[PDB]
Amino acid sequence: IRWTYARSANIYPNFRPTPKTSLLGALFGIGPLFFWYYVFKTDRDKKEKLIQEGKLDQTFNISY
Amino acid sequence: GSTFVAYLPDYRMQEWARREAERLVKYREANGLPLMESNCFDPNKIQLPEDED
Protein backbone atom coordinates (compact mmCIF):
# COMPACT_ATOMS: atom_id res chain seq x y z
CA ILE A 1 0.00 0.00 0.00
CA ARG A 2 2.84 2.39 0.83
CA TRP A 3 4.53 1.60 -2.49
CA THR A 4 1.41 2.24 -4.57
CA TYR A 5 0.53 5.39 -2.62
CA ALA A 6 4.05 6.80 -2.95
CA ARG A 7 4.11 6.05 -6.67
CA SER A 8 0.68 7.60 -7.34
CA ALA A 9 -0.65 10.06 -4.78
CA ASN A 10 2.30 11.31 -2.71
CA ILE A 11 3.98 12.87 -5.76
CA TYR A 12 2.41 16.32 -6.06
CA PRO A 13 2.31 17.36 -2.35
CA ASN A 14 6.08 16.76 -2.27
CA PHE A 15 6.69 18.56 -5.57
CA ARG A 16 8.69 21.77 -5.37
CA PRO A 17 9.38 24.01 -8.39
CA THR A 18 13.18 24.10 -8.65
CA PRO A 19 15.55 25.07 -11.47
CA LYS A 20 16.19 21.38 -12.17
CA THR A 21 12.51 20.39 -12.28
CA SER A 22 11.55 23.52 -14.23
CA LEU A 23 14.28 22.97 -16.82
CA LEU A 24 13.57 19.25 -17.18
CA GLY A 25 9.83 19.85 -17.49
CA ALA A 26 10.32 22.55 -20.11
CA LEU A 27 12.70 20.37 -22.12
CA PHE A 28 10.89 17.02 -21.92
CA GLY A 29 7.46 18.57 -22.45
CA ILE A 30 8.09 21.33 -25.00
CA GLY A 31 11.19 20.40 -26.99
CA PRO A 32 9.76 17.27 -28.64
CA LEU A 33 6.65 19.17 -29.76
CA PHE A 34 8.62 21.90 -31.51
CA PHE A 35 11.14 19.40 -32.91
CA TRP A 36 8.37 17.37 -34.53
CA TYR A 37 6.59 20.53 -35.67
CA TYR A 38 9.75 21.72 -37.42
CA VAL A 39 10.33 18.33 -39.05
CA PHE A 40 6.76 17.95 -40.32
CA LYS A 41 6.43 21.59 -41.41
CA THR A 42 9.65 21.41 -43.42
CA ASP A 43 8.52 18.16 -45.05
CA ARG A 44 5.10 19.54 -46.00
CA ASP A 45 6.55 22.81 -47.33
CA LYS A 46 8.93 20.82 -49.53
CA LYS A 47 6.08 18.65 -50.81
CA GLU A 48 3.83 21.66 -51.47
CA LYS A 49 6.55 23.48 -53.42
CA LEU A 50 7.17 20.34 -55.49
CA ILE A 51 3.44 20.04 -56.23
CA GLN A 52 3.16 23.70 -57.24
CA GLU A 53 6.12 23.36 -59.60
CA GLY A 54 4.41 20.24 -60.97
CA LYS A 55 7.45 17.95 -60.59
CA LEU A 56 6.18 15.23 -58.26
CA ASP A 57 4.75 12.44 -60.50
CA GLN A 58 1.60 11.53 -58.57
CA THR A 59 0.44 9.10 -61.27
CA PHE A 60 -1.92 6.39 -59.94
CA ASN A 61 -2.25 8.29 -56.62
CA ILE A 62 -6.03 7.98 -56.39
CA SER A 63 -6.70 7.14 -52.72
CA TYR A 64 -5.75 9.58 -49.96
CA GLY B 1 -30.11 -9.46 -35.57
CA SER B 2 -26.92 -10.66 -37.25
CA THR B 3 -28.99 -12.50 -39.87
CA PHE B 4 -31.10 -9.37 -40.38
CA VAL B 5 -27.98 -7.23 -40.88
CA ALA B 6 -26.48 -9.80 -43.26
CA TYR B 7 -29.55 -9.69 -45.54
CA LEU B 8 -30.08 -5.93 -45.51
CA PRO B 9 -31.23 -4.81 -48.98
CA ASP B 10 -28.83 -2.83 -51.17
CA TYR B 11 -29.92 0.73 -50.44
CA ARG B 12 -26.29 1.87 -50.80
CA MET B 13 -26.60 0.93 -54.50
CA GLN B 14 -23.33 -0.90 -55.13
CA GLU B 15 -24.62 -3.34 -57.75
CA TRP B 16 -26.60 -0.53 -59.39
CA ALA B 17 -23.38 1.46 -59.74
CA ARG B 18 -21.63 -1.62 -61.13
CA ARG B 19 -24.31 -2.08 -63.79
CA GLU B 20 -24.26 1.61 -64.71
CA ALA B 21 -20.47 1.57 -65.04
CA GLU B 22 -20.65 -1.57 -67.18
CA ARG B 23 -23.11 0.05 -69.59
CA LEU B 24 -21.06 3.25 -69.78
CA VAL B 25 -17.82 1.37 -70.46
CA LYS B 26 -19.51 -0.73 -73.15
CA TYR B 27 -20.93 2.34 -74.89
CA ARG B 28 -17.71 4.36 -74.74
CA GLU B 29 -15.51 1.51 -75.98
CA ALA B 30 -18.01 0.81 -78.77
CA ASN B 31 -18.01 4.40 -80.03
CA GLY B 32 -14.34 5.19 -79.37
CA LEU B 33 -15.01 7.75 -76.64
CA PRO B 34 -12.06 8.08 -74.20
CA LEU B 35 -13.69 6.34 -71.19
CA MET B 36 -13.74 8.83 -68.27
CA GLU B 37 -13.49 12.51 -69.19
CA SER B 38 -11.22 14.96 -67.38
CA ASN B 39 -13.99 17.56 -66.97
CA CYS B 40 -16.85 16.73 -64.61
CA PHE B 41 -19.02 19.55 -66.00
CA ASP B 42 -18.88 20.48 -69.67
CA PRO B 43 -17.25 23.90 -70.19
CA ASN B 44 -20.12 25.11 -72.40
CA LYS B 45 -22.16 25.98 -69.28
CA ILE B 46 -19.37 27.70 -67.31
CA GLN B 47 -18.84 31.44 -67.80
CA LEU B 48 -15.27 32.21 -66.78
CA PRO B 49 -14.34 35.80 -65.86
CA GLU B 50 -12.31 37.72 -68.43
CA ASP B 51 -9.03 38.87 -66.89
CA GLU B 52 -7.84 41.31 -69.58
CA ASP B 53 -4.59 41.77 -67.66
Binding site: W3, T4, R7, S8, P32, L33, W36, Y37, V39, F40, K41, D43, R44, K47, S63, Y64 | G1, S2, F4, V5, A6, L8, P9, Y11, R12, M13
Partner: protein, 459 residues
Amino acid sequence: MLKIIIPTTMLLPMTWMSKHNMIWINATVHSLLISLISLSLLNQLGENSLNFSLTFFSDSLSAPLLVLTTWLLPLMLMASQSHLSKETTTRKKLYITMLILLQLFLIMTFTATELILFYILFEATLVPTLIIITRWGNQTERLNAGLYFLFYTLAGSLPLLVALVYIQNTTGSLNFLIIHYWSHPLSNSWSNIFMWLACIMAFMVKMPLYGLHLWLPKAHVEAPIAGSMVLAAVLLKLGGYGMMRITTILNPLTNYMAYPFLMLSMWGMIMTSSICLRQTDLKSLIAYSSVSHMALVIVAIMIQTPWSFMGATALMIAHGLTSSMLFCLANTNYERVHSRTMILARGLQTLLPLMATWWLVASLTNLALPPSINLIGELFIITASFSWSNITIILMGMNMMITALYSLYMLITTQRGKYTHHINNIKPSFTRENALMALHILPLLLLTLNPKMILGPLY
Protein backbone atom coordinates in the same frame (compact mmCIF):
# COMPACT_ATOMS: atom_id res chain seq x y z
CA MET C 1 -36.64 8.01 -34.57
CA LEU C 2 -39.35 8.05 -31.90
CA LYS C 3 -39.73 4.27 -32.24
CA ILE C 4 -36.48 4.09 -30.26
CA ILE C 5 -36.92 7.16 -28.05
CA ILE C 6 -40.38 6.33 -26.67
CA PRO C 7 -39.53 2.80 -25.40
CA THR C 8 -36.38 4.18 -23.77
CA THR C 9 -38.57 6.69 -21.94
CA MET C 10 -41.02 3.91 -21.03
CA LEU C 11 -38.11 2.11 -19.37
CA LEU C 12 -38.41 4.57 -16.45
CA PRO C 13 -42.02 3.81 -15.34
CA MET C 14 -41.36 0.13 -15.98
CA THR C 15 -38.38 0.33 -13.64
CA TRP C 16 -40.24 2.25 -10.94
CA MET C 17 -43.41 0.12 -10.95
CA SER C 18 -41.45 -3.14 -11.03
CA LYS C 19 -41.33 -5.59 -8.15
CA HIS C 20 -38.44 -5.32 -5.72
CA ASN C 21 -36.83 -8.55 -6.98
CA MET C 22 -37.58 -8.11 -10.70
CA ILE C 23 -35.92 -4.80 -11.62
CA TRP C 24 -32.80 -6.31 -13.20
CA ILE C 25 -34.69 -8.92 -15.24
CA ASN C 26 -37.18 -6.47 -16.71
CA ALA C 27 -34.57 -3.79 -17.38
CA THR C 28 -32.23 -6.24 -19.13
CA VAL C 29 -34.97 -7.80 -21.27
CA HIS C 30 -36.43 -4.51 -22.44
CA SER C 31 -33.02 -2.93 -23.06
CA LEU C 32 -32.13 -5.91 -25.26
CA LEU C 33 -35.41 -5.45 -27.14
CA ILE C 34 -34.65 -1.75 -27.66
CA SER C 35 -31.22 -2.72 -29.01
CA LEU C 36 -32.86 -5.14 -31.45
CA ILE C 37 -35.20 -2.37 -32.61
CA SER C 38 -32.32 0.09 -33.02
CA LEU C 39 -30.53 -2.46 -35.22
CA SER C 40 -32.80 -1.34 -38.08
CA LEU C 41 -31.00 2.01 -38.34
CA LEU C 42 -28.07 0.23 -39.99
CA ASN C 43 -29.85 0.23 -43.36
CA GLN C 44 -28.25 3.38 -44.76
CA LEU C 45 -28.00 4.88 -48.23
CA GLY C 46 -25.10 6.17 -50.28
CA GLU C 47 -27.19 9.34 -50.61
CA ASN C 48 -27.74 12.12 -48.06
CA SER C 49 -29.23 10.65 -44.87
CA LEU C 50 -32.26 9.19 -43.11
CA ASN C 51 -34.00 12.51 -42.41
CA PHE C 52 -36.92 11.34 -40.29
CA SER C 53 -38.22 14.77 -39.29
CA LEU C 54 -37.11 18.36 -38.77
CA THR C 55 -35.61 17.44 -35.38
CA PHE C 56 -33.87 14.08 -35.86
CA PHE C 57 -31.87 12.45 -38.65
CA SER C 58 -29.61 9.42 -38.93
CA ASP C 59 -26.42 8.75 -40.86
CA SER C 60 -23.99 5.90 -41.31
CA LEU C 61 -21.81 7.81 -38.85
CA SER C 62 -24.64 8.04 -36.30
CA ALA C 63 -26.11 4.55 -36.76
CA PRO C 64 -23.18 2.49 -35.37
CA LEU C 65 -22.85 4.87 -32.42
CA LEU C 66 -26.57 4.52 -31.70
CA VAL C 67 -26.36 0.72 -31.91
CA LEU C 68 -23.37 0.69 -29.55
CA THR C 69 -25.19 3.00 -27.13
CA THR C 70 -28.29 0.80 -27.04
CA TRP C 71 -26.21 -2.38 -26.72
CA LEU C 72 -24.12 -1.07 -23.81
CA LEU C 73 -27.09 -0.66 -21.44
CA PRO C 74 -27.86 -4.38 -20.82
CA LEU C 75 -24.16 -5.06 -20.31
CA MET C 76 -23.96 -2.24 -17.77
CA LEU C 77 -26.98 -3.65 -15.94
CA MET C 78 -25.36 -7.10 -15.79
CA ALA C 79 -22.08 -5.62 -14.55
CA SER C 80 -23.85 -3.54 -11.88
CA GLN C 81 -26.03 -6.39 -10.57
CA SER C 82 -23.20 -7.79 -8.44
CA HIS C 83 -21.86 -4.90 -6.35
CA LEU C 84 -25.34 -3.41 -5.78
CA SER C 85 -26.73 -6.44 -3.93
CA LYS C 86 -26.91 -4.85 -0.45
CA GLU C 87 -28.51 -1.61 -1.69
CA THR C 88 -32.07 -0.51 -0.94
CA THR C 89 -34.72 -0.89 -3.63
CA THR C 90 -35.23 2.86 -4.09
CA ARG C 91 -31.52 3.51 -4.62
CA LYS C 92 -31.22 0.62 -7.08
CA LYS C 93 -34.13 2.11 -9.01
CA LEU C 94 -32.38 5.49 -8.92
CA TYR C 95 -29.22 3.89 -10.33
CA ILE C 96 -31.18 2.29 -13.18
CA THR C 97 -32.92 5.64 -13.73
CA MET C 98 -29.55 7.37 -14.12
CA LEU C 99 -28.45 4.77 -16.67
CA ILE C 100 -31.70 5.13 -18.64
CA LEU C 101 -31.48 8.93 -18.64
CA LEU C 102 -27.90 8.73 -19.90
CA GLN C 103 -28.99 6.42 -22.72
CA LEU C 104 -31.85 8.76 -23.66
CA PHE C 105 -29.57 11.80 -23.74
CA LEU C 106 -26.99 9.97 -25.87
CA ILE C 107 -29.60 8.65 -28.31
CA MET C 108 -30.98 12.13 -28.93
CA THR C 109 -27.54 13.74 -29.13
CA PHE C 110 -26.36 11.48 -31.96
CA THR C 111 -29.52 12.03 -34.05
CA ALA C 112 -30.09 15.75 -33.40
CA THR C 113 -30.18 17.81 -36.61
CA GLU C 114 -29.52 21.14 -34.89
CA LEU C 115 -26.19 22.26 -33.44
CA ILE C 116 -27.84 23.96 -30.46
CA LEU C 117 -29.99 20.90 -29.73
CA PHE C 118 -26.83 18.80 -29.98
CA TYR C 119 -25.07 21.11 -27.51
CA ILE C 120 -27.93 20.92 -25.00
CA LEU C 121 -28.05 17.11 -25.00
CA PHE C 122 -24.24 16.88 -25.18
CA GLU C 123 -24.18 18.79 -21.89
CA ALA C 124 -27.21 16.97 -20.46
CA THR C 125 -25.15 13.77 -20.57
CA LEU C 126 -22.98 15.25 -17.78
CA VAL C 127 -25.48 15.21 -14.89
CA PRO C 128 -26.23 11.44 -14.79
CA THR C 129 -22.53 10.60 -15.13
CA LEU C 130 -21.56 13.01 -12.35
CA ILE C 131 -24.24 11.60 -10.04
CA ILE C 132 -23.18 8.02 -10.82
CA ILE C 133 -19.51 8.79 -10.17
CA THR C 134 -19.92 10.80 -6.97
CA ARG C 135 -22.76 8.77 -5.40
CA TRP C 136 -21.93 5.10 -6.10
CA GLY C 137 -18.15 5.49 -6.38
CA ASN C 138 -16.12 3.60 -3.80
CA GLN C 139 -13.07 5.62 -2.71
CA THR C 140 -12.96 9.15 -1.29
CA GLU C 141 -11.24 10.54 -4.41
CA ARG C 142 -14.50 10.20 -6.37
CA LEU C 143 -15.65 13.66 -5.26
CA ASN C 144 -12.48 15.25 -6.61
CA ALA C 145 -12.75 13.06 -9.70
CA GLY C 146 -16.27 14.32 -10.32
CA LEU C 147 -15.17 17.93 -10.00
CA TYR C 148 -12.47 17.41 -12.60
CA PHE C 149 -14.82 15.62 -14.98
CA LEU C 150 -17.20 18.53 -14.69
CA PHE C 151 -15.09 21.63 -14.92
CA TYR C 152 -12.70 20.55 -17.67
CA THR C 153 -15.77 19.75 -19.76
CA LEU C 154 -17.50 23.03 -19.00
CA ALA C 155 -14.30 25.02 -19.47
CA GLY C 156 -14.26 23.76 -23.05
CA SER C 157 -17.95 23.98 -23.85
CA LEU C 158 -18.94 27.44 -22.64
CA PRO C 159 -17.00 29.14 -25.50
CA LEU C 160 -18.58 26.74 -28.02
CA LEU C 161 -22.07 27.90 -27.07
CA VAL C 162 -20.99 31.49 -27.68
CA ALA C 163 -19.54 30.58 -31.07
CA LEU C 164 -22.69 28.65 -31.93
CA VAL C 165 -25.07 31.54 -31.34
CA TYR C 166 -22.65 33.83 -33.16
CA ILE C 167 -22.78 31.52 -36.17
CA GLN C 168 -26.57 31.55 -36.13
CA ASN C 169 -26.56 35.34 -36.23
CA THR C 170 -24.34 35.30 -39.31
CA THR C 171 -25.52 32.37 -41.44
CA GLY C 172 -29.07 32.44 -40.07
CA SER C 173 -29.24 28.71 -39.34
CA LEU C 174 -27.61 25.99 -37.26
CA ASN C 175 -29.35 23.09 -39.03
CA PHE C 176 -26.63 20.71 -40.18
CA LEU C 177 -28.08 20.11 -43.66
CA ILE C 178 -28.29 23.84 -44.43
CA ILE C 179 -24.87 24.39 -42.84
CA HIS C 180 -23.37 21.74 -45.12
CA TYR C 181 -25.08 22.95 -48.29
CA TRP C 182 -24.33 26.65 -47.66
CA SER C 183 -20.74 26.29 -46.44
CA HIS C 184 -18.36 29.20 -47.06
CA PRO C 185 -14.58 29.41 -46.62
CA LEU C 186 -13.04 30.79 -43.45
CA SER C 187 -10.56 33.57 -44.18
CA ASN C 188 -7.31 33.72 -42.24
CA SER C 189 -8.17 36.25 -39.53
CA TRP C 190 -7.71 36.58 -35.78
CA SER C 191 -11.48 36.56 -35.28
CA ASN C 192 -11.72 33.42 -37.43
CA ILE C 193 -8.83 31.86 -35.48
CA PHE C 194 -10.66 32.38 -32.20
CA MET C 195 -13.92 31.11 -33.69
CA TRP C 196 -12.03 27.99 -34.81
CA LEU C 197 -10.61 27.54 -31.31
CA ALA C 198 -14.04 27.98 -29.72
CA CYS C 199 -15.58 25.42 -32.10
CA ILE C 200 -12.75 22.91 -31.59
CA MET C 201 -11.69 23.01 -27.93
CA ALA C 202 -14.91 21.60 -26.44
CA PHE C 203 -14.58 18.46 -28.56
CA MET C 204 -10.81 18.28 -27.98
CA VAL C 205 -11.21 18.26 -24.20
CA LYS C 206 -13.60 15.27 -24.25
CA MET C 207 -11.60 13.00 -26.58
CA PRO C 208 -9.39 13.76 -24.53
CA LEU C 209 -6.52 15.59 -26.21
CA TYR C 210 -3.07 15.05 -24.73
CA GLY C 211 -2.38 17.73 -22.14
CA LEU C 212 -6.12 18.14 -21.49
CA HIS C 213 -6.57 14.51 -20.42
CA LEU C 214 -5.95 14.78 -16.67
CA TRP C 215 -9.63 14.32 -15.79
CA LEU C 216 -9.94 10.94 -17.52
CA PRO C 217 -7.73 8.71 -15.31
CA LYS C 218 -9.32 10.18 -12.19
CA ALA C 219 -12.87 9.72 -13.47
CA HIS C 220 -12.32 6.22 -14.85
CA VAL C 221 -10.50 4.82 -11.81
CA GLU C 222 -12.98 6.38 -9.38
CA ALA C 223 -16.21 5.47 -11.19
CA PRO C 224 -18.26 2.32 -10.61
CA ILE C 225 -18.03 -0.35 -13.29
CA ALA C 226 -21.06 0.82 -15.29
CA GLY C 227 -19.78 4.39 -15.17
CA SER C 228 -16.38 3.28 -16.46
CA MET C 229 -18.05 1.28 -19.23
CA VAL C 230 -20.20 4.17 -20.45
CA LEU C 231 -17.38 6.71 -20.08
CA ALA C 232 -14.87 4.69 -22.09
CA ALA C 233 -17.25 3.26 -24.69
CA VAL C 234 -19.60 6.13 -25.61
CA LEU C 235 -18.83 9.44 -23.88
CA LEU C 236 -15.35 9.69 -25.41
CA LYS C 237 -16.81 9.33 -28.91
CA LEU C 238 -19.01 12.41 -28.45
CA GLY C 239 -16.00 14.63 -29.11
CA GLY C 240 -15.09 12.67 -32.22
CA TYR C 241 -18.64 12.86 -33.56
CA GLY C 242 -18.78 16.59 -32.81
CA MET C 243 -15.47 17.30 -34.54
CA MET C 244 -16.54 15.22 -37.54
CA ARG C 245 -19.73 17.26 -37.77
CA ILE C 246 -18.29 20.74 -37.17
CA THR C 247 -15.16 20.62 -39.36
CA THR C 248 -17.31 21.34 -42.44
CA ILE C 249 -17.46 25.07 -41.58
CA LEU C 250 -13.82 25.40 -40.51
CA ASN C 251 -12.07 25.13 -43.87
CA PRO C 252 -9.53 26.13 -45.09
CA LEU C 253 -8.35 27.25 -41.63
CA THR C 254 -7.90 23.62 -40.53
CA ASN C 255 -5.06 23.35 -43.06
CA TYR C 256 -2.84 25.23 -40.61
CA MET C 257 -4.82 25.44 -37.36
CA ALA C 258 -4.44 21.66 -36.98
CA TYR C 259 -0.65 21.70 -36.54
CA PRO C 260 -0.49 22.25 -32.73
CA PHE C 261 -3.02 19.50 -32.04
CA LEU C 262 -1.57 17.01 -34.53
CA MET C 263 1.83 17.27 -32.85
CA LEU C 264 0.17 17.10 -29.43
CA SER C 265 -1.48 13.90 -30.61
CA MET C 266 1.39 12.30 -32.50
CA TRP C 267 3.83 12.78 -29.65
CA GLY C 268 1.09 12.30 -27.07
CA MET C 269 0.18 8.79 -28.20
CA ILE C 270 3.79 7.85 -27.51
CA MET C 271 3.84 9.30 -24.00
CA THR C 272 0.58 7.77 -22.81
CA SER C 273 1.56 4.41 -24.29
CA SER C 274 4.87 4.56 -22.44
CA ILE C 275 2.93 5.53 -19.32
CA CYS C 276 1.11 2.20 -19.61
CA LEU C 277 4.47 0.44 -19.28
CA ARG C 278 4.90 1.69 -15.69
CA GLN C 279 1.47 1.52 -14.04
CA THR C 280 0.46 -0.18 -10.81
CA ASP C 281 -3.32 0.13 -11.32
CA LEU C 282 -5.26 -1.87 -13.92
CA LYS C 283 -7.97 0.75 -14.45
CA SER C 284 -5.36 3.50 -14.78
CA LEU C 285 -3.54 1.46 -17.44
CA ILE C 286 -6.76 0.85 -19.39
CA ALA C 287 -7.65 4.55 -19.20
CA TYR C 288 -4.24 5.60 -20.54
CA SER C 289 -4.58 3.11 -23.40
CA SER C 290 -7.92 4.77 -24.17
CA VAL C 291 -6.11 8.11 -24.30
CA SER C 292 -3.62 6.73 -26.85
CA HIS C 293 -6.34 5.32 -29.12
CA MET C 294 -8.28 8.58 -28.97
CA ALA C 295 -5.12 10.49 -29.91
CA LEU C 296 -5.02 8.39 -33.07
CA VAL C 297 -8.68 9.28 -33.69
CA ILE C 298 -7.85 12.99 -33.25
CA VAL C 299 -5.09 12.70 -35.86
CA ALA C 300 -7.52 10.98 -38.22
CA ILE C 301 -10.13 13.72 -37.87
CA MET C 302 -7.60 16.54 -38.28
CA ILE C 303 -6.15 14.99 -41.46
CA GLN C 304 -9.60 15.38 -43.09
CA THR C 305 -9.43 12.72 -45.81
CA PRO C 306 -11.88 9.93 -46.71
CA TRP C 307 -9.59 7.15 -45.46
CA SER C 308 -9.00 9.15 -42.27
CA PHE C 309 -12.73 9.43 -41.58
CA MET C 310 -13.36 5.75 -42.31
CA GLY C 311 -10.53 4.71 -40.01
CA ALA C 312 -11.69 7.07 -37.27
CA THR C 313 -15.23 5.67 -37.30
CA ALA C 314 -14.04 2.06 -37.27
CA LEU C 315 -11.52 2.74 -34.49
CA MET C 316 -14.14 4.53 -32.37
CA ILE C 317 -16.48 1.53 -32.48
CA ALA C 318 -13.69 -1.01 -31.93
CA HIS C 319 -12.17 0.89 -29.01
CA GLY C 320 -15.56 1.28 -27.36
CA LEU C 321 -16.14 -2.47 -27.33
CA THR C 322 -12.56 -3.37 -26.36
CA SER C 323 -12.19 -0.87 -23.51
CA SER C 324 -15.57 -1.85 -22.07
CA MET C 325 -14.48 -5.51 -22.07
CA LEU C 326 -11.14 -4.68 -20.42
CA PHE C 327 -12.82 -2.64 -17.68
CA CYS C 328 -15.26 -5.50 -17.04
CA LEU C 329 -12.39 -7.99 -16.69
CA ALA C 330 -10.52 -5.72 -14.28
CA ASN C 331 -13.69 -5.28 -12.22
CA THR C 332 -14.30 -9.03 -12.10
CA ASN C 333 -10.85 -9.32 -10.54
CA TYR C 334 -11.46 -6.40 -8.18
CA GLU C 335 -14.71 -7.83 -6.78
CA ARG C 336 -12.74 -10.90 -5.69
CA VAL C 337 -9.60 -9.18 -4.43
CA HIS C 338 -10.76 -5.63 -3.49
CA SER C 339 -7.35 -4.10 -4.28
CA ARG C 340 -7.11 -2.86 -7.90
CA THR C 341 -3.33 -3.41 -7.89
CA MET C 342 -1.85 -5.44 -10.74
CA ILE C 343 0.77 -7.44 -8.86
CA LEU C 344 -1.41 -8.59 -5.96
CA ALA C 345 -3.48 -11.29 -7.68
CA ARG C 346 -1.15 -13.31 -9.89
CA GLY C 347 -1.16 -16.56 -11.85
CA LEU C 348 -4.92 -16.48 -12.36
CA GLN C 349 -4.81 -18.67 -15.49
CA THR C 350 -4.33 -21.65 -13.18
CA LEU C 351 -7.37 -20.80 -11.04
CA LEU C 352 -9.68 -19.32 -13.73
CA PRO C 353 -8.86 -20.72 -17.20
CA LEU C 354 -11.90 -19.51 -19.16
CA MET C 355 -11.51 -16.01 -17.75
CA ALA C 356 -7.88 -16.26 -18.87
CA THR C 357 -9.15 -17.00 -22.39
CA TRP C 358 -11.35 -13.90 -22.19
CA TRP C 359 -8.30 -11.90 -21.05
CA LEU C 360 -6.29 -13.21 -24.00
CA VAL C 361 -8.96 -12.31 -26.55
CA ALA C 362 -9.41 -8.82 -25.09
CA SER C 363 -5.64 -8.22 -25.08
CA LEU C 364 -5.38 -9.45 -28.67
CA THR C 365 -8.15 -7.09 -29.76
CA ASN C 366 -6.56 -4.13 -27.97
CA LEU C 367 -3.26 -5.12 -29.62
CA ALA C 368 -4.97 -4.69 -33.04
CA LEU C 369 -4.48 -8.20 -34.40
CA PRO C 370 -5.70 -8.56 -38.00
CA PRO C 371 -8.36 -8.87 -39.23
CA SER C 372 -9.99 -7.18 -36.22
CA ILE C 373 -11.75 -3.89 -36.87
CA ASN C 374 -9.31 -2.28 -34.43
CA LEU C 375 -6.53 -2.97 -36.92
CA ILE C 376 -8.77 -1.91 -39.82
CA GLY C 377 -9.26 1.53 -38.30
CA GLU C 378 -5.62 1.80 -37.24
CA LEU C 379 -4.33 0.84 -40.69
CA PHE C 380 -6.65 3.22 -42.54
CA ILE C 381 -5.57 6.06 -40.25
CA ILE C 382 -1.90 5.14 -40.70
CA THR C 383 -2.21 5.07 -44.50
CA ALA C 384 -3.94 8.46 -44.52
CA SER C 385 -1.24 9.87 -42.23
CA PHE C 386 1.47 8.46 -44.49
CA SER C 387 -0.11 10.29 -47.41
CA TRP C 388 -0.21 13.43 -45.24
CA SER C 389 3.53 13.03 -44.53
CA ASN C 390 5.77 9.99 -44.98
CA ILE C 391 7.66 10.74 -41.73
CA THR C 392 4.57 10.07 -39.56
CA ILE C 393 5.07 6.31 -40.02
CA ILE C 394 7.97 6.52 -37.55
CA LEU C 395 5.79 7.72 -34.69
CA MET C 396 2.92 5.48 -35.77
CA GLY C 397 5.22 2.49 -35.99
CA MET C 398 6.64 3.16 -32.54
CA ASN C 399 3.16 3.34 -31.04
CA MET C 400 2.26 -0.03 -32.51
CA MET C 401 5.22 -1.73 -30.87
CA ILE C 402 4.67 -0.04 -27.53
CA THR C 403 0.98 -0.93 -27.55
CA ALA C 404 1.67 -4.63 -27.98
CA LEU C 405 4.20 -4.52 -25.16
CA TYR C 406 1.94 -3.06 -22.53
CA SER C 407 -1.03 -5.14 -23.66
CA LEU C 408 0.91 -8.35 -23.23
CA TYR C 409 2.40 -6.94 -20.04
CA MET C 410 -1.07 -6.69 -18.55
CA LEU C 411 -1.78 -10.24 -19.70
CA ILE C 412 1.42 -11.68 -18.25
CA THR C 413 1.41 -10.00 -14.84
CA THR C 414 -2.13 -11.04 -13.90
CA GLN C 415 -2.57 -14.41 -15.62
CA ARG C 416 0.85 -16.09 -15.72
CA GLY C 417 3.49 -16.97 -13.16
CA LYS C 418 2.73 -18.47 -9.75
CA TYR C 419 -0.47 -17.79 -7.83
CA THR C 420 -0.30 -15.64 -4.72
CA HIS C 421 -0.24 -18.03 -1.78
CA HIS C 422 -2.27 -16.13 0.82
CA ILE C 423 -5.16 -15.23 -1.53
CA ASN C 424 -7.60 -18.09 -0.92
CA ASN C 425 -10.95 -16.42 -1.76
CA ILE C 426 -10.87 -16.69 -5.57
CA LYS C 427 -14.16 -18.41 -6.39
CA PRO C 428 -15.12 -19.98 -9.72
CA SER C 429 -16.36 -17.54 -12.34
CA PHE C 430 -20.12 -17.02 -12.40
CA THR C 431 -22.27 -17.50 -15.48
CA ARG C 432 -23.06 -13.77 -15.37
CA GLU C 433 -19.42 -12.74 -15.82
CA ASN C 434 -18.76 -15.26 -18.60
CA ALA C 435 -21.91 -14.14 -20.42
CA LEU C 436 -20.82 -10.51 -20.02
CA MET C 437 -17.46 -11.23 -21.66
CA ALA C 438 -19.08 -13.29 -24.43
CA LEU C 439 -21.58 -10.51 -25.19
CA HIS C 440 -18.69 -8.06 -25.35
CA ILE C 441 -16.49 -10.12 -27.64
CA LEU C 442 -18.89 -11.81 -30.10
CA PRO C 443 -20.10 -8.53 -31.72
CA LEU C 444 -16.49 -7.50 -32.51
CA LEU C 445 -15.67 -10.70 -34.39
CA LEU C 446 -19.07 -10.57 -36.08
CA LEU C 447 -18.43 -6.98 -37.19
CA THR C 448 -15.15 -7.98 -38.81
CA LEU C 449 -17.31 -9.88 -41.35
CA ASN C 450 -19.20 -6.75 -42.50
CA PRO C 451 -16.83 -3.81 -41.92
CA LYS C 452 -18.83 -1.51 -44.23
CA MET C 453 -21.35 -1.09 -41.38
CA ILE C 454 -18.78 0.76 -39.25
CA LEU C 455 -16.82 2.62 -41.92
CA GLY C 456 -18.94 5.78 -41.80
CA PRO C 457 -20.60 7.90 -44.48
CA LEU C 458 -17.51 8.17 -46.70
CA TYR C 459 -17.52 4.46 -47.57
